[PDB]
Amino acid sequence: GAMNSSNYAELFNNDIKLFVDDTNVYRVTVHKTFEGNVATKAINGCIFTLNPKTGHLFLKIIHTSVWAGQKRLSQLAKWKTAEEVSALVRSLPKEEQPKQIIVTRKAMLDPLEVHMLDFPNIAIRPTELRLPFSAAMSIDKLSDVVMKATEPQMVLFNIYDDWLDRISSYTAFSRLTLLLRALKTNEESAKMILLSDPTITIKSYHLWPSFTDEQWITIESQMRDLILTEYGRKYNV
């Protein structure tokens, strides 16, 4: 059934699973035409498919050419996401294929279900959690690879960097969702927080800075402060 606070630690057991988020698949800018009408221009996009246990991120870049000549792009986006998750599973060895796929939005259930009808032993699940994966495009290196792509392309990342060397996957997912929640509520502050100290760098093969354990606790606290605050600045409290 649905994934919620009550069955949260299931994400970190030894059953392979993937989150699929489609928020950033179909992305547009809205602008005025010379005639004063409004028009959209699509920009590149991405499917965010994440193993929460390992940190393995399969970032499927969605190049604007996939929309050319198509109608009803919001609906098509969901089916395209489903088509791409489906070939990802088909290309992976049987022992790596997920036993569950959890979608962050319920409108992905029916698309993913038809695409995987010949995979009856993979459970497709929704969730009641309001996970902040849309903020994935606020991670500079992921935004960069999406925007520079000139053709469809799959890029593999570990979104936990090397954290699993020192913390458990439960703690690594909690850190990740805190960072993404922060970047989603106030991207500028969040980024200032992460990059304030010039001496802490991001390794070429990482996405985030090389914080010590002590520094991560400071950072995490600073991100909590931000989230409560903006929640004040928002509801005035």
Binding site: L76, W79, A82, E83, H115, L117
Partner: protein
């Protein structure tokens, strides 16, 4: 005109014949139903006075044999049986009519309702849905489950309706996952019509029989099958024009005949609102949409 005699009426029972019904009291001198129109299937059905649980009944065609009802006190129901001795049968029926111990099938001359609800229903196809080859009539009751329900337990007592599943291999072509799910024309026209039913008349026959079993027995899996066969047509962008026209007449007479008080449980809000207002065929069912809006505007 044909006749279904009854040996007797030992227990108090509400008897249905087609869309008509009448009450018979315990040991009342009742010996059956006469003047039944030849040329149509019929259903004779029962609801005991003590146990409104289990409505049950028999589908039959009078052209296929001489049939009668006899109460069985061991199994506790009114049982349909065939009489093979035609002289014994005619002699029995003639005596009961002479003594005027039979109720007359009460058809109004103007009234095409039964014809319209059973236009495409054939006894041969009923017997393939309700498998009991040794009898020429078919027993159905409220509790019988469908083959597809049994996939989600006794196969002998099942309703072998044609399985329709919108998120399936027959339904969906490899590489046409979005096309075939949003526009079910290929599932309707090639798989079901051309492949399984052969023609729209057999399709409409099963769709009418499912309705009738949902209405007369409150059979839940038959209701599921009726709404599914409607939904498959409404969800198909490409449907022969003659089929849309006939479907509108079919549904119109079903909606007209439904008891107003049973609409809450026999009509699926989602399917009906989708078919009449969202689907490809939202503008092709004028008679059905008109009677639904005037009779059941709450559901919509």
């Amino acid at each position: 005109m044909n006749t279904v005699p009854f040996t007797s009426a030992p227990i108090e029972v509400t008897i249905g014949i087609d869309q008509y019904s009448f009450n018979v009291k315990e040991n009342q001198p009742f010996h059956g139903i006469k003047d039944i129109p030849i040329g149509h299937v019929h259903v004779i059905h029962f609801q005991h006075a003590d146990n409104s649980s289990m409505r049950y009944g028999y589908w039959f065609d009078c052209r296929m044999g001489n049939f009668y009802i006899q109460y069985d006190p061991k199994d506790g129901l009114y049982k349909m049986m065939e009489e093979r001795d035609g002289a014994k049968f005619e002699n029995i029926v003639h005596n009961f009519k002479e003594r005027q111990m039979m109720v007359s099938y009460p058809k109004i001359d103007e009234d095409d309702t039964w014809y319209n609800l059973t236009e495409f229903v054939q006894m041969d196809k009923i017997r393939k849905i309700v498998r009991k080859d040794e009898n020429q009539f078919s027993y159905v009751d409220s509790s019988m489950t469908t083959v597809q329900e049994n996939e989600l337990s006794d196969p002998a007592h099942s309703l072998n309706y044609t399985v329709i599943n919108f998120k399936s291999r027959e339904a969906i072509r490899p590489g046409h996952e979005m096309e075939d799910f949003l526009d079910k024309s290929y599932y309707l026209n090639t798989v079901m019509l051309q492949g399984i039913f052969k023609n729209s008349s057999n399709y409409f026959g099963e769709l009418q029989f499912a309705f009738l079993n949902a209405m007369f027995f409150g059979n839940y899996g038959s209701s599921l099958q009726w709404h599914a066969m409607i939904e498959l047509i409404c969800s198909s962008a490409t449907v022969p024009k003659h089929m849309l026209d006939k479907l509108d007449e079919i549904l119109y007479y079903q909606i007209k005949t439904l008891p107003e008080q049973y609409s809450d449980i026999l009509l699926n809000e989602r399917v009906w609102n989708i078919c009449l207002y969202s689907s490809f065929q939202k503008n092709s069912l004028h008679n059905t949409e008109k009677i639904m809006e005037n009779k059941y505007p709450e559901l919509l």
